[PDB]
């Protein structure tokens, strides 16, 4: 057990186990979605996936493009990975 | 007064007054930067601007592209605007 090659990690504060099961849930339903409500309830079923599995309130952000974040202290789990040149940002916002 | 026409507001939890001074500081130095060594430390002198002016720790994310966030309760000031088709996201992470 390791992360699929399809998934390219940008950043993680997280166990591989939790990265992997984010992997498994994401890769099948993610590439189907292309314009805006495709993605709108995609993020939402990803958020709703995390809250069920990992606990707390989660924020899921999807990006088509390139980005730059200041670095600051970020308290909860965060996972950032590219799947087929589309970025996925996960933040647990509560426990 | 009002916001310059260049700035297209995506979301705000903020006074116009505080939105405007983000406009003021951003528009001159933001469009100049294209490289990652530019933008990487652009976000940073934007963050470092907000922390001095508005207080607390801020997270500034710049995007070249299109994006989708889940909707959730977001506690502090947040401003999101497009300037010359490059989006700028501000989050105060503490006060």
Author numbering:
A (entry chain C), B (entry chain A): 83 to 177
Reproduce, without paraphrasing, sentences from the article in which this PDB structure was first reported:
Tegumental protein of 20.8 kDa from Clonorchis sinensis elicits IgA immune responses in the host and does not cause an IgG response. For this reason, we named the 20.8-kDa tegumental protein from Clonorchis sinensis as CsTAL3. The interesting thing is that similar results were reported for SmTAL2 and FhCaBP2, 40. Both proteins belong to the TAL protein family of the class of fluke proteins that consist of a calmodulin like domain (or N-terminal domain) and a DLC-like domain (or C-terminal domain) as in CsTAL3. In this work, we determined 2.6 Å crystal structure of the DLC-like domain (amino acid [aa] positions 83–177) and 1.3 Å crystal structure of the calmodulin like domain (aa positions 1–81) of CsTAL3.
At first, we tried crystalizing full-length CsTAL3 (aa 1–184), but the crystal structure contained only the DLC-like domain (aa 83–177). The monomeric structure of the DLC-like domain consists of four anti-parallel β-strands that are packed with each other and an extended loop protruding from β-sheets; the other face of the β-sheets is packed with two α-helices. Despite low sequence identity, the DLC-like domain of CsTAL3 shows structural similarities with the DLC-like domain of FhCaBP2 and 8-kDa human dynein light chain (LC8) with root mean square (r.m.s.) deviation 0.79 and 2.65 Å when 69 Cα and 49 Cα atoms are aligned in Pymol41, respectively. The dimeric interface information calculated by PISA42 is that the dimeric interface area is on average ~1044 Å2 (17.4%) at the total solvent-accessible area of 6033 Å2, and the solvation free energy gain upon formation of the interaction is on average −15.2 kcal/mol. The five residues (G147 to T152) of each protomer in the extended loop interact with five residues (V′142 to D′146) of the neighboring protomer in the β2-strand via a pair of hydrogen bonds. Side chains of these strands also contribute to the hydrophobic interaction. Nonetheless, despite the conservation of the structural characteristics, the amino acid sequences of the dimeric interface are not conserved relative to the other DLC families. The DLC-like domain of CsTAL3 also contains a hydrophobic groove. The superimposition of LC8 with the peptide and DLC-like domain shows a similar conformation. This result suggests that CsTAL3 may interact with its binding partner proteins in a similar manner.
